[PDB]
Write a structure and sequence with these properties.
This is part of a larger assembly, with two copies of chain A (612 residues). The first copy, chain A, is mainly alpha-helical and 612 residues long. In chain A, 40% of the residues lie in helices and 3% in strands. Chain A starts with a helix and ends with a strand. At the A-B interface, strand 2, helix 22, helix 23, helix 26 and helix 27 of A face helix 1, helix 24, helix 25 and helix 27 of B. Chains A, B: Belongs to the transient receptor (TC 1.A.4) family. TrpV subfamily. TRPV5 sub-subfamily.
Amino acid sequence: QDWEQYRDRVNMLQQERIRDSPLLQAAKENDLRLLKILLLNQSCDFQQRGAVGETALHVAALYDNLEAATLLMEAAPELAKEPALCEPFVGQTALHIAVMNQNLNLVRALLARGASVSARATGAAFRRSPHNLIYYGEHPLSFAACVGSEEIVRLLIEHGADIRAQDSLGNTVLHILILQPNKTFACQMYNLLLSYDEHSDHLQSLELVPNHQGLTPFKLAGVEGNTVMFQHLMQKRKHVQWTCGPLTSTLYDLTEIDSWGEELSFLELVVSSKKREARQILEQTPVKELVSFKWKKYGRPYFCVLASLYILYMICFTTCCIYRPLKLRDDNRTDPRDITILQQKLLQEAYVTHQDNIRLVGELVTVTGAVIILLLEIPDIFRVGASRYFGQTILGGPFHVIIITYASLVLLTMVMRLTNMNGEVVPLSFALVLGWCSVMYFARGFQMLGPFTIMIQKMIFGDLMRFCWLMAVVILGFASAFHITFQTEDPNNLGEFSDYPTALFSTFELFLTIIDGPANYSVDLPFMYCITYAAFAIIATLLMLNLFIAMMGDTHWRVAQERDELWRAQVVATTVMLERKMPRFLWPRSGICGYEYGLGDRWFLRVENHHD
Amino acid sequence: QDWEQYRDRVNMLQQERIRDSPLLQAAKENDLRLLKILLLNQSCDFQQRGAVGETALHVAALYDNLEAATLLMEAAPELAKEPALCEPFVGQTALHIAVMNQNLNLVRALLARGASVSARATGAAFRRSPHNLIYYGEHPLSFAACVGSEEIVRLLIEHGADIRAQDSLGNTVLHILILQPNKTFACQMYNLLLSYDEHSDHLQSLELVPNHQGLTPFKLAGVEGNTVMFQHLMQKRKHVQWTCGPLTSTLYDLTEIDSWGEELSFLELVVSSKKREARQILEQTPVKELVSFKWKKYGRPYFCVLASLYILYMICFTTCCIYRPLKLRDDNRTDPRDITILQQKLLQEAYVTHQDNIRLVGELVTVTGAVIILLLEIPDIFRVGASRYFGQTILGGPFHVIIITYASLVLLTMVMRLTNMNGEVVPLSFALVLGWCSVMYFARGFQMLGPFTIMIQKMIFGDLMRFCWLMAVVILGFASAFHITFQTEDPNNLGEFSDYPTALFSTFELFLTIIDGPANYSVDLPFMYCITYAAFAIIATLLMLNLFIAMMGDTHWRVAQERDELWRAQVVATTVMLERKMPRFLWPRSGICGYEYGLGDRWFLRVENHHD
C-alpha cells in the first residue's frame, strides 16, 4: 500500500470510536452537562482510548473546548502526562495539541498542572518530507514559535522551556524558523528569542549551533535561499564608520563568508544548492561586493592564462593525429571486391625516422596531459558525490563527462600503439570531436560569449530531444517504406536504398534536405515512389522542420531573464572552484585584516553607499 | 594595487586614531562632559590629527553634533581655516563637511567666525570618474547647490559666495547642476541662482560661460541628454505673437542652435554624443521643427542627386573590369599538370586598339573618382579623431572603412598596370565586393529602406559573430575527423577530403547544406564515416542552424523601438554632414532673419501650436 492511504485509514478509524464511546462523544460537542454526569458513576478508566491511542483530553484539546477540558483534568489527575501510541503519532501529548490551536487559556491551565515542556513528538507524521504540509519540529516550544503566537512563546520560557534543545534531525528552534514559508513574519519572532538567551552558556552563541550535517542557522539561511533572514543576520556584523553627505562608509565583518574551512565554505553551499532561490543570496550587498573582487582582480587573469594552455594543447594533439605512421598499401586485396577503396594501413615506426621524433615529443605532451586531467577530476568526484557533480549545470555541469572521456581515449590510443592493434582510427575520431567541443567550456568568463553557451546546453536537453523521440518514428516510417518499393528495382540506377542500414541513413539525410530527392529522369521509377515521396516532403520538410525553428524561437524568450541570472552564478562557481586548486603562493586572503589597526583578529571588507 | 583597495586602507586607518585619541573619541560620541574637561588641562595641540590629517572639528562636523562642535571653536580660534592633507582629500575644510550634511545651525556658526567661502577641495576623490558616486565640484557653494538645500544656498551668497567661480575641469555652478541624476529637482534651484546674478558683470550672461572643452551650459544640456533642462533654458528665448482660438503662434529664437561656428555646432554634438539619452533632444519642439525643414526642403534632393552619381560610377567601373586585356594563351604549360585549367594571361594593350580607348576613358573616370573619395574622407578623419569616427554607427559608421578600402584598391590596380604585374585579379575581386556593398550606404533616406539596413549592421556585430566563435570549433571538430577516415581511401572516389585546407572547406559547406552529403553508392565507404556523419547532421544542421534562426527571431523584436528611434537620428546626422561640405552657393541660411522687421540681428523660426 501507499503511505498516503495508510494514514487515511487511521484518521478515520479514530472518528469511529469517538462515535462509539459516549464519553468521547460529548468531548467534541462541548456537551458539558453529560460530561458532568458521566464522570460521576465510575469515571471511565482512561486506557479506554482511540485506535491512535489518545485519551479524552487529547480529543478535548483537538477541538476549541475550554470548559470540557478543565472538567476532565479535575476528575482525572494525570491526563497532561500521557502520550499517543500510534506510530505516525508517537508522543504527541495534550500540550502539543493545545499550543497548535493558539488556545490562550487552555495552555495556561495545562502548565498550572505541571505538564512536561520537554516531551518529544517522535511520530512519522512530524518529520520533514515532501508529503507532509508542516514541519514544526518536536518540542512544544517549537510548535509555538512556528504558528506566530508570541504570547505562548514567552509563556513557555517562564516555565522552563530550553531554547537550546534539538530534535532528531538536529535542528534547533532557530533552524526551523528559516524553513518556514511565512518568511517575513518570523523576523519579528527571531528578535524575541535572542532576548531570552542566557548569555551564560559558553556554548558559543546560539546563532552558531550546528546541525547534524553541519549547517549553522546563518549558513542555512543561504542554502535555503532566504533573502530576508540573510540581511537580518548581517545587521549584527556591520560597523558604520562615517556619514559624509550622502555617503556612508559601512564596514562588514566577513568571517562567516570568509570561511577558511576544510569543506564547509559558505560560497560553495550557496551555488551547489538544489533550491532555486539560493541564486539570490549572491546579489546581497556584503557578498556581491566580494565575488566581484575575487573575479576581477585575480580570478579573471588566472582563467585566461589557463584557457590558452588548453588551446595550445589541443593544437598540439591534432598535429600529432594528422602526422601518423601511414606506409604505402603493401597488398593487392583492394583488387578483389572493387567496391573497396582501401589503402595503406599502419606501421611501427616512431623510432626509425627524422620527423617522427618531432612527432614523438608532440605525443608525450599529449600523453602526460591526459593524465593530469585524470588527476584533477577523479579526486573531485568523491567530494561532491558522483551524482550531484555530473548534473548541477552550474558547478561544472556536463563538461566533466566530456573532459574525462577525452582523457580516457588518449590513453587507449597509447595501448592501441605498442601492441600493434589495427583500429586506431576509432578512438582518434572520438577524441577530436570531444576534445575540441570541450574548449567551449572556457566561455565562462567573457560576458559576450557567456550566456550563449548555456542556451546550447538548455536546447540540447530540453527541446532537441523531445523533438527526436517523435522523429525516430517518422524516419522509421518512411525509411522502411522506401526499402519496400526499391527492393524489386536494380541498385545501379537510383541505389540510395540498397541495404536496410542505409535505407534509414539516406532517409535521415533526406529529412534535412542535405541529400537531394533521389531521382533519375532517364529511367522509370515505380509509381508508388512518387506518392510516398510527395507525402514525405510535406510532413518532414515543410511541417516538422519549420515547427522546430518555431519551438526554438519561443522557448528562447522564456529563458531570457533566466540564462542571464544563471551566468552571474556561473562566474561565482568558477571562482570558488579555482580557490581550492591553486596554491597559496597565488591568492593572498581577501579583505583587509585587523590586528595591526587593532580591534580583533577578523578580516574585514569595506563598502560605501550613496543614498539616492 | 587597485585604487579601490587603496582608499579602503585610508578610511579605516582614520577610524583607528579616533579610537586611540581620547579627545577625538568624545567628538564622535557627543560626550559633552568629557570635551569640557579634556580641553581645560592643556587643550591638545591640534596638529594631533588623523592619518588623513584632519583636526578635531572635521571629526565633529563629520557627525551631526552641534554642541561639541561649538565648544571646540571657542577654545581653539582657528579650526575653521585648516585643510586636510591626504592626497585623495586635499583641502576639504570643516565648511565643506558641514554643508554636505545639510546642518543648518553649524553652517551659521562657522560663517560667523569668518571661514573662507572660496576654499578649493582639490582631492583625488572629488574629481569626476566612473568609480566615484558623487561629483559635486570644489567650492562650497557648489556643495550646497547639489544637495537641494536652498537655505544654505542663499546664506552663502549673502556672505560673499561668487557664482562665477570655476573648478579644475572648468565647470561653473551651473554646469554641475546639469550633471546630476536628480534631474527634475534642480530646475527649482536654477531659477534661484539667476536672481542672485549681478547683472553688472559684462562677462556676457552666466548661461554662456564656456567650459575648458568649450561647452556652454546650454550646449551641455544637449550633450548630456537632459530633456528637462533643455525646455527650461528655452523659455527665455521664445516669443508669443498671437492666440487665435486654439492656435498659438510662438516664435523661437534659433541662435544657439543656428550656430554658424567653425566646429562647435550644437547639432553636431548632440548626434555624436556617447550618451544614450542625447537622442531625445532631437524630438523637442524648437529642434524637431528645424531638422525636418532642412531635410525635406534641401537635404532630400541633394542626397538623391548624389546617390545616382554613385550608381552611374559603379556601373562605369564594372564595365571596365569585364572588358580587360586578356589575350589568348600563348603557352602549352597547361598540358603538364592536367589538373590545371588555366589559359590567357594579360597584355599591355590599352594603346593599340579600337575598343580599348572607349575602355580607356572609362578607366580615368574610375581613377579620378577614387582620388576624390580620398580627398573627402582623409581630412575628415582628424576632425573627429580616428577612433570615434569609425565606430559611432550614426555619424557614418562602418561605411567609411569600406569607402576608403574601395578607393585604395582602385589605385593599386593602376600600379598593377603600368609595371606589368600579374595578379591583377586579386584587387579587382576585392574592389567589386566592397564597392557595390557601399552603395547600400545610400539607404539613409528612403523611410522604406531606412531602418532595414541598420538591422543588417546590428546582426553582423552582435548576433552573427557570437554564433561564429562557437562554430569555428564544430567545423574544426568534424573536418579534422573526416580527414582521418578518408586518409586511407583513394581520392578518385569520394574525394572531397583530399587535402587539409579543403577538409575544412568541404565541411564548412556541408554545414550549410550547400554541398550534398558526400556519398557514392557504387563503392564501400568506411563504416566509421556513416557514424560520424549521422552525428554531424544532428548537431550542425538540425540544431545549430535552426537555433540561429531563432536567435535572429527574438533579438529582432527587442530592437523594435530602438532601430526606429535610431533611424530618425541618422537623418539628422546626414543633414549636418552635408552642410559642412556643399558650398554656400547651395543652402541659404535657415530661418527668417530679422533686421528688416526690425527687432535685432537674430534669425528666427516660426512654429504654431494647437491646444488639444
